[PDB]
Amino acid sequence: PRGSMITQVNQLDELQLKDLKTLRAECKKNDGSIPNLYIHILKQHRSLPTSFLYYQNGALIGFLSIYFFAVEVAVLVSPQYRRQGIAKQLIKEALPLLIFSCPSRLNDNWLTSKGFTYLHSEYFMERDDLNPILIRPLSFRMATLEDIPILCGLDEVCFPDSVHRFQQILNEREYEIVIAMLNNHPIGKSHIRWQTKRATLSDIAILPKEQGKGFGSALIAHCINMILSEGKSRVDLDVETHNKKALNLYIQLGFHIQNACDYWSIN
Numbered sequence: 001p002r003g004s005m006i007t008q009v010n011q012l013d014e015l016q017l018k019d020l021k022t023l024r025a026e027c028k029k030n031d032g033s034i035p036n037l038y039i040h041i042l043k044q045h046r047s048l049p050t051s052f053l054y055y056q057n058g059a060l061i062g063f064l065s066i067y068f069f070a071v072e073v074a075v076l077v078s079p080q081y082r083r084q085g086i087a088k089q090l091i092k093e094a095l096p097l098l099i100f101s102c103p104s105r106l107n108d109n110w111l112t113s114k115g116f117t118y119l120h121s122e123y124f125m126e127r128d129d130l131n132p133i134l135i136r137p138l139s140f141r142m143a144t145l146e147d148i149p150i151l152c153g154l155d156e157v158c159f160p161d162s163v164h165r166f167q168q169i170l171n172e173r174e175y176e177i178v179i180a181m182l183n184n185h186p187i188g189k190s191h192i193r194w195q196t197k198r199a200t201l202s203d204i205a206i207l208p209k210e211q212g213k214g215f216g217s218a219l220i221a222h223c224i225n226m227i228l229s230e231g232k233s234r235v236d237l238d239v240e241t242h243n244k245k246a247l248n249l250y251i252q253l254g255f256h257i258q259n260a261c262d263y264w265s266i267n
């Protein structure tokens with residue numbers, strides 16, 4: 001009680017950042033997944049004091065932060081000190097001034113009972129198998145700037161400023177987009193962000209009318225193989241869903257869940 005301290009901090013200096021990662025690892029090991037913390041964000045000054053740090057005897061045991069992108073609340077309490085009022089004190093420090101990101105399966109029963117509402121879930125998946133995948137009537141090509149109409153059309157029906165977003169992606173050298181063609185019709189796309197040791201698939205879209213035919217799996221399998229041919233040892237994948245049933249697609253291709261969050265809401 002004497003040794004318990006809450007500091008409201010407009011931006012995390014270096015040392016505060018290193019303590020958070022200690023707390024994150026600890027929560028990661030105990031819960032399996034962690035909330036979104038947005039580390040690169042936590043370093044910038046903002047207009048109101050945003051991150052809330054709970055210390056016990058100088059040791060960080062709780063953290064709550066608010067993000068301005070609606071508002072996203074991330075809350076993290078050391079397993080040793082849970083159910084002792086810590087999160088409750090932490091939101092009050094942010095109540096006079098809500099989308100919670102939540103480790104999948106941890107808090108499902110009691111979030112409903114209080115009147116939270118489930119939005120959707122996000123998954124970071126990883127495929128570490130170095131063996132390729134080993135046949136649909138699809139061809140593939142890399143998108144260019146002259147594919148902007150196609151790319152905007154696909155994004156319109158699969159994720160209801162697209163022109164300039166795709167202009168920005170296509171002009172960034174770490175990014176490429178693969179287009180899937182059914183005969184002479186583009187029916188899908190996948191974005192690749194390349195790094196030295198790995199590459200990340202995102203924004204995978206198949207036209208609604210062409211779904212259920214294996215084109216999605218063929219597209220991702222093509223991107224996996226393309227990544228392995230370049231000597232990467234890992235394919236990552238970010239996908240947002242409303243239902244867990246949707247992940248079997250990626251489980252079949254060798255992806256494993258590395259992190260999983262459910263976005264819940266309240267006011």
Ligand SMILES: CC(C)(COP(=O)(O)OP(=O)(O)OC[C@H]1O[C@@H](n2cnc3c(N)ncnc32)[C@H](O)[C@@H]1OP(=O)(O)O)[C@@H](O)C(=O)NCCC(=O)NCCS
Nearest residue numbers: 075076077082083084085086087088100101102103106110
């Ligand atoms: C979710 C989390 C932040 C709660 O921290 P906490 O300090 O243990 O929660 P508090 O003690 O402040 O509040 C407890 C109350 O909120 C609910 N609550 C919190 N944890 C609960 C749990 N395991 N089971 C049921 N209700 C819970 C209850 O209403 C509880 O009532 P109580 O007063 O009788 O204890 C903590 O469990 C954690 O860090 N989990 C990993 C990250 C996470 O799930 N973030 C989502 C944030 S909502």
Ligand SMILES: CC(C)(COP(=O)(O)OP(=O)(O)OC[C@H]1O[C@@H](n2cnc3c(N)ncnc32)[C@H](O)[C@@H]1OP(=O)(O)O)[C@@H](O)C(=O)NCCC(=O)NCCS
Nearest residue numbers: 158202203204205206211212213214215216217239249252
């Ligand atoms: C999500 C999406 C990309 C999937 O595309 P899709 O072409 O319908 O996916 P597929 O047809 O390849 O696979 C669907 C199911 O058939 C299975 N499948 C594919 N090939 C199979 C095969 N040879 N044998 C058995 N099952 C197969 C898959 O396992 C999958 O699940 P199931 O086992 O329960 O049946 C598509 O729905 C879409 O574009 N949605 C809008 C955007 C979106 O949701 N993006 C999320 C990724 S960022």
Ligand SMILES: O=C(N[C@H](CO)[C@H](O)c1ccc([N+](=O)[O-])cc1)C(Cl)Cl
Nearest residue numbers: 035036037038039040122124238240
């Ligand atoms: O949440 C999203 N994206 C990122 C991953 O690209 C995710 O939220 C994230 C947040 C914080 C973080 N961190 O704290 O280092 C990592 C990933 C949206 Cl695509 Cl829903």
